[PDB]
Design a protein around this ligand. Structure first.
Ligand code: CLA
Ligand code: CLA
Ligand code: CLA
Ligand code: CLA
Ligand SMILES: CC(=O)O[C@H]1CC(C)(C)C(=C=C/C(C)=C/C=C/C(C)=C/C=C/C=C(C)/C=C/C=C(\C)C(=O)C[C@@]23O[C@]2(C)C[C@@H](O)CC3(C)C)[C@](C)(O)C1
Ligand SMILES: CC(=O)O[C@H]1CC(C)(C)C(=C=C/C(C)=C/C=C/C(C)=C/C=C/C=C(C)/C=C/C=C(\C)C(=O)C[C@@]23O[C@]2(C)C[C@@H](O)CC3(C)C)[C@](C)(O)C1
Ligand code: KC2
Ligand code: KC2
Ligand code: KC2
Ligand code: KC2
Ligand code: KC2
Ligand SMILES: CC1=C(C#C/C(C)=C/C=C/C(C)=C/C=C/C=C(C)/C=C/C=C(C)/C=C/[C@@]23O[C@]2(C)C[C@@H](O)CC3(C)C)C(C)(C)C[C@H](O)C1
Lengths: 238, 179, 228, 211
């Protein structure tokens, strides 16, 4: 995009404010590929943080209320039940109590999705380009059209085609709602985690978020026997 | 000096010469400066790589160093200075003498001399016996020469950090006090 | 003429006093450079001293009264209730070194030809604006915010208002200098600033020595403190 | 917004007071006896500073009269019949307990911390809705420092683009049109009154606090 279009989108997201860049991060040229590339990267970062944050907000609400799945997570005569992962503690403790294979495969599945989004050939095959090259800032390409060898049932966005045949006006309105909901949901999820780590940080939630001891920004806990994990966790931090 | 290579985005496209040593440098003096820089950079790259491999824990040379006199590659130890102290004086003299022969061949054999209008750092034998950097175009070759200069400048600072950690103990962080 | 500009600036600073140079430093030939370059130097020095003295006064109120950031940092070795001369004395030696080094890097960027030329300016002794810190538009790694006006609150301000702001900068910097050394002087010659009698505690130790006492040699890094 | 965050002056385009003569006119209109009583000489200032002082006086009048009436009611002991806490599994506190805490300062002190934060948050929301230039210009006025009427609270109920995501029922000032239509200058009479009883309530509330 350009700064003018970014200002217009800000006006459409909140006409009272309009553009709000106190740091002038849009003019901050990072990656040395022009203001258009920088604004594209920032827009994608906002959209992706928002998507992950709203998803994690719903996940935190669902997991913190004792709504584990009925089926099991590990397989064998001694397998970690999802109920055991629930009983591990609060949601962050559930993640830390996951098996190492579960953690690795979750994060690597997400990584596969991320590189799939970042590749320009698949984006061009699905239409549009990389978000730093004029494409739509936040747009996951089609795992079907990319040409993976086996035919996948569904794409990641809109698997059942419910937003299909949407009005273009509804599409723009939906993207505005996506950005704003993500903007608020980032604060929501970080407020949950901040209440978990520092009690009383978010005054409204008092006694309603379980405590947590380990670092939340540490995907692998002490149970994860992998290279350097224990040495990394040896020294803690606020 | 502005048209001598080695400048990059790290300086900002300009020459890094605050003390003004380039002002008092002629063409021959500038060629000498570049030749010394290239030699020191290459030596420091080799020295850092060797010291890091030896001290880090990499698989060092199998077998004996001296069958008679009973000195072994494993027995020499992983401290760099202690290893260079315990290696035989014959071996030290041999390394130094071969390096000296190569230095004198670099000085004399390359007849268009880097001081007398030649390319600094053009040691003819000791480069690319397998011909890897033979088909590279001038642009990528200049890029790689700048890479040589940058990497080796970093290597010089690295090896001086190593010897500072060995001499002035607890001097550099990320170097255990012994060495 | 640079002298004429300086006299007009003094009249703007205070028309009652006007140009007040009892020593003729504006006519001194510092380094043998001409009067324009010397006046550039003196104006830069005045503005720099005033700026740092204003920051020093605000930081004296911050440290002595008690105003600290939370978390792991240099703040956790300074004893509580320590006075403003003991805070700098009590921070780690690396903290003192890196503070002075960062200030040095900012000085270097302030006087570097690269940044001042990228901003379309010249050195303050070579026909430039005395007291101008350039944007970091020539630093190797693209830099988020500049030193002066980081949020660009003065992107659209009148040149007359900017001139009046510089007139304010000089005067307030002079007054801040006087106040800050009032604080320093009351601790090493008591009864010298009558108002501060009983407020500023005495301090036994050379102010002008930066690295004395050297302070603790603690290692405050936690995650990945391999250098310890 | 970043283009308007100037920290400086822009030319005025209204009939609002921007000089000592204009201040004197309003001074005699408020009270022909005293006139302009400006020993500190804060009439000898810029238009923006004059508007700032005018709005500050008006806002102190609002808060002081509200404080005086609240002080009188809370001293009378006309408490609310509700419970002030204890519905989301929290301890139970009653307005009767807040009243029995002590005098109105003690009552505010006995008020729970998040209750204080929420009240101050609402007041801050009102303050910044007042200060929002874009809202006033969607409405019919500007910021008081830049030539706007000092004291205008913008409407919180609206259907414009600058309207809240959820509809708001009523506005802060005149929710049910109790002003309806005063005459085009009886509004100004009421403004003069507001300034006078605002000053009187200012003196009254500080005197009561001192007592
Ligand atoms: C190995 C797995 C993997 C991979 C390859 C990526 C790749 C990426 N992620 Mg990440 N991400 C991952 C796991 C992974 N992610 C997981 C498990 C999550 C949790 C759901 C996220 C959540 C996430 C968010 C919310 C965002 C990214 C972003 C990015 C991009 C920016 C990379 C960057 O500059 O970071 C710097 C890289 C390093 C410092 C290297 C560290 C090693 C890139 C496509 C950001 C993006 O797209 O910005 C435009 C972004 O917004 N990721
Ligand atoms: C043997 C050491 C050595 C030598 C001979 C040179 C020589 C040169 N460097 Mg330097 N350089 C070195 C080490 C050295 N460098 C190291 C380790 C670094 C990394 C910090 C740099 C970083 C560097 C940069 C960033 C640049 C140069 C450039 C140059 C040229 C500058 C002109 C001049 O008059 O320099 C003569 C220099 C000397 C005679 C130095 C003698 C030793 C000093 C005085 C004392 C030691 C200081 C101490 C360690 C601190 C010249 C070819 C510039 C270039 O490429 O120009 C075309 C350039 O841009 N160098
Ligand atoms: C240039 C600096 C330098 C110096 C002063 C030394 C000094 C020493 N090294 Mg050597 N070493 C170097 C570079 C250097 N090394 C490099 C670049 C490496 C590769 C990582 C090694 C790897 C190495 C090992 C693994 C060991 C030594 C050891 C030793 C000691 C006995 C001599 C010996 O046999 O070394 C061998 C020296 C070399 C092979 C010279 C390096 C290569 C030069 C630059 C020529 C290029 C050849 C090319 C790579 C060949 C490809 C085919 C001595 C303290 C021994 C010791 O006592 O360890 C405790 C030992 O076991 N070094
Ligand atoms: C977070 C809440 C909040 C916010 C955003 C504001 C904002 C403001 N108040 Mg304050 N105010 C608050 C709470 C708040 N107030 C409360 C709870 C009260 C009690 C009713 C007041 C009573 C009050 C008065 C009486 C005045 C202000 C004024 C101001 C202005 C300048 C404040 C300033 O510079 O302070 C210093 C930094 C500004 C519009 C002043 C004003 O109207 O300026 C024209 C003024 O005189 N406020
Ligand atoms: C905080 C703090 O204090 O940190 C401390 C810790 C820390 C950071 C560790 C420190 C250090 C030391 C450092 C970082 C030292 C760095 C050393 C460095 C940078 C060392 C380069 C060697 C390069 C070599 C041998 C290359 C050979 C390469 C060769 C033979 C070739 O190029 C060949 C070839 O490529 C061509 C040309 C053509 C291509 O067709 C391919 C081929 C293969 C044919 C310090 C200074 O103490 C500071
Ligand atoms: C070194 C070390 O360890 O340090 C320690 C010590 C230290 C530093 C003290 C620590 C701390 C404390 C910290 C850093 C605390 C930070 C707290 C923080 C950051 C608190 C923000 C609240 C923001 C709110 C409520 C915003 C609401 C905003 C709202 C209502 C909106 O979103 C509105 C809106 O945007 C939408 C949704 C989008 C648009 O449609 C419309 C607009 C724009 C209007 C740590 C963590 O302990 C670490
Ligand atoms: C992020 C999403 C995700 C994807 C896309 C994905 C795809 C595939 C594919 C196809 C490409 C195969 C063929 C496959 C196979 C197995 N998965 Mg797997 N998987 C994902 C997630 C998890 C999690 C969280 C766990 C898990 C597991 C297992 C076990 C072993 C079970 C056991 O221990 O009996 C087997 C055989 C569990 C485990 O323990 O893995 C060692 C476990 O917790 N998977 N998985
Ligand atoms: C955690 C995941 C996630 C969440 C929770 C979430 C929520 C919301 C909300 C609710 C607040 C709204 C209202 C909304 C609306 C739209 N989303 Mg969306 N979304 C998520 C993920 C993705 C991805 C991966 C894509 C995407 C898209 C679109 C389009 C398509 C417009 C078009 O076809 O032009 C519209 C209208 C696709 C796209 O192309 O966006 C440019 C696309 O790739 N979304 N999205
Ligand atoms: C701690 C340090 C510090 C303090 C305490 C301080 C206080 C004040 C005060 C308060 C009494 C006023 C009123 C004032 C005014 C101006 N300051 Mg100043 N200032 C400090 C630092 C810097 C730096 C780094 C720069 C700078 C500048 C300007 C310009 C020029 C604008 C222009 O001409 O564009 C104006 C008008 C920039 C410049 O170019 O100065 C020649 C510049 O780089 N200031 N400054
Ligand atoms: C404005 C000034 C300023 C700047 C611009 C700046 C820049 C950089 C950069 C540049 C990219 C790096 C890479 C870097 C690295 C480290 N800084 Mg540093 N730093 C500044 C200030 C301080 C202070 C006050 C302290 C400090 C420290 C450390 C430690 C060691 C921690 C430890 O050993 O526990 C490390 C590794 C602390 C310290 O040494 O504590 C004993 C400490 O207190 N720094 N710092
Ligand atoms: C609790 C707080 C509070 C109190 C105690 C209080 C008392 C009195 C009294 C005393 C008996 C009178 C006689 C009076 C009169 C007027 N008040 Mg007032 N008032 C309060 C609050 C507000 C707010 C928020 C606004 C406001 C206004 C007006 C207008 C203008 C109407 C117009 O011309 O539109 C008139 C005539 C609006 C305005 O624009 O004020 C400049 C406006 O926004 N008032 N007000
Ligand atoms: C604890 C818990 C639960 C819960 C809960 C829930 C849902 C709690 C909800 C609480 C809620 C919803 C609390 C609102 C307060 C609103 C206030 C004080 C508004 C004041 C508003 C005021 C003073 C407005 C004034 C005016 O508007 C007036 C009148 C007219 C306008 O012209 C002018 C203005 C704007 C000034 C469950 C669901 C039971 C189970 C769960 O497991 C845990």
């Amino acid at each position: 995009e350009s700064k003018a279009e970014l200002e217009s989108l800000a006006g459409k997201l909140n006409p009272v404010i309009g553009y709000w860049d106190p740091l002038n991060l849009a003019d901050y040229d990072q990656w040395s590929q022009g203001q258009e590339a920088a604004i594209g990267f920032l827009r994608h970062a906002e959209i992706k943080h928002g998507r992950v944050a709203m998803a994690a907000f719903v996940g935190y609400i669902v997991q913190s209320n004792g709504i584990c799945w009925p089926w099991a997570l590990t397989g064998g005569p001694n397998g970690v039940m999802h109920s055991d992962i629930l009983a591990a503690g609060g949601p962050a403790d559930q993640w830390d109590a996951l098996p190492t294979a579960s953690k690795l495969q979750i994060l690597l599945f997400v990584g596969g999705l991320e590189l799939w989004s970042e590749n320009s050939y698949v984006l061009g095959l699905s239409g549009e380009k990389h978000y730093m090259r004029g494409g739509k800032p936040g747009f996951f390409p089609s795992i079907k059209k990319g040409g993976i060898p086996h035919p996948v049932p569904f794409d990641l966005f809109d698997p059942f085609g419910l937003s299909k045949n949407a009005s273009p006006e509804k599409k723009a309105k939906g993207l505005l709602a996506e950005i704003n909901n993500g903007r608020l949901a980032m604060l929501g999820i970080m407020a949950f985690v901040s209440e978990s780590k520092v009690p009383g940080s978010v005054p409204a939630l008092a006694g309603k978020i379980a405590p947590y001891s380990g670092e939340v920004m540490a995907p692998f806990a002490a149970s994860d026997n992998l290279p350097f994990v224990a040495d990394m966790l040896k020294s803690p931090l606020f | 000096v502005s048209d001598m290579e080695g400048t990059g985005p790290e300086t900002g496209g300009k020459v890094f010469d605050p003390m003004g040593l380039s002002k008092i440098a002629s063409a021959e003096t500038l060629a000498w400066y570049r030749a010394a820089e290239l030699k020191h950079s290459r030596v420091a790259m080799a020295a850092v790589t060797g010291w890091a491999w030896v001290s880090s824990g990499g698989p060092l040379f199998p077998g004996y160093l001296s069958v008679e006199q009973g000195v072994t590659f494993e027995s020499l130890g992983r401290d760099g200075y202690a290893a260079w102290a315990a290696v035989p004086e014959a071996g030290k003299f041999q390394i130094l003498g071969v390096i000296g022969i190569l230095e004198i061949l670099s000085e004399s054999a390359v007849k268009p001399h880097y001081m007398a209008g030649g390319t600094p750092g053009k040691v003819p034998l000791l480069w690319d016996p397998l011909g890897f950097t033979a088909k590279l175009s001038p642009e990528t070759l200049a890029r790689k020469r700048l890479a040589e200069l940058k990497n080796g400048r970093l290597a010089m600072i690295g090896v001086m950090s190593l010897v500072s950690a060995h001499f002035i103990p607890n001097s550099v962080p990320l170097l255990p006090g012994s060495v | 003429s640079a002298k004429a500009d300086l006299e007009a600036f003094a009249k703007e600073c205070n028309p009652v006093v006007g140009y007040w140079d009892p020593l003729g430093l504006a006519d001194l030939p510092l380094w043998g450079q001409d009067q324009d370059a010397v006046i550039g130097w003196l104006r830069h020095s005045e503005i720099k001293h005033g700026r740092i003295a204003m920051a020093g006064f605000v930081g004296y109120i911050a440290h002595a009264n008690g105003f600290r950031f939370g978390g792991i940092g240099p703040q956790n070795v300074v004893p509580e209730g320590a006075s403003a001369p003991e805070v700098w004395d009590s921070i780690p030696f690396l903290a003192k070194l890196q503070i002075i080094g960062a200030i040095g890097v900012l000085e270097h960027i302030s006087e570097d030809k690269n940044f001042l030329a990228a901003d379309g300016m010249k050195h303050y002794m070579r026909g430039g604006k005395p007291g101008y810190f350039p944007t970091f538009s020539a630093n190797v790694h693209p830099m988020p915010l500049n030193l002066f006006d980081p949020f660009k609150w003065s992107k659209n301000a009148s040149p007359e208002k900017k001139a009046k702001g510089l007139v304010t900068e000089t005067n307030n910097g002079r007054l801040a200098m006087l106040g800050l050394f009032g604080f320093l002087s009351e601790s090493k010659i008591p009864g010298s600033v009558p108002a501060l009698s009983g407020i500023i505690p005495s301090y036994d130790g050379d102010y002008m020595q930066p690295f004395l006492p050297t302070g603790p040699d603690t290692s405050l890094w936690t995650i990945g403190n391999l250098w310890a | 917004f970043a283009d308007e965050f100037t920290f400086d002056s822009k030319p005025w385009s209204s009939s609002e007071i921007k000089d000592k003569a204009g201040l004197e006119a309003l001074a005699k209109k408020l009270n022909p006896t005293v006139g302009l009583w400006d020993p500190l000489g804060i009439a000898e200032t810029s238009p923006e500073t004059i508007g700032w002082f005018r709005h500050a006086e008006i806002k102190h009048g609002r808060v002081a009269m509200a404080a005086f009436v609240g002080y009188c009611v809370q001293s009378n002991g006309i408490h609310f019949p509700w419970n002030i806490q204890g519905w989301q599994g929290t301890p139970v506190v009653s307005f009767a307990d807040i009243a029995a805490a002590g005098g109105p300062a003690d009552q505010w002190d006995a008020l729970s911390t998040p209750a204080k934060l929420q009240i101050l948050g609402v007041i801050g929301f009102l303050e910044m809705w007042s200060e929002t230039s874009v809202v006033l210009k969607a409405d019919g006025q500007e910021h008081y420092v830049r030539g706007g009427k000092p004291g205008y609270f913008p409407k919180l109920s609206r259907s414009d683009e600058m309207a809240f995501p959820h509809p708001v029922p009523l506005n802060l000032w005149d929710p049910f049109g109790f002003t309806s239509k005063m005459t085009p200058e009886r509004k100004e009479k009421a403004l003069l009154a507001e300034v006078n009883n605002g000053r009187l309530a200012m003196i009254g509330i500080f005197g009561m606090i001192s007592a």
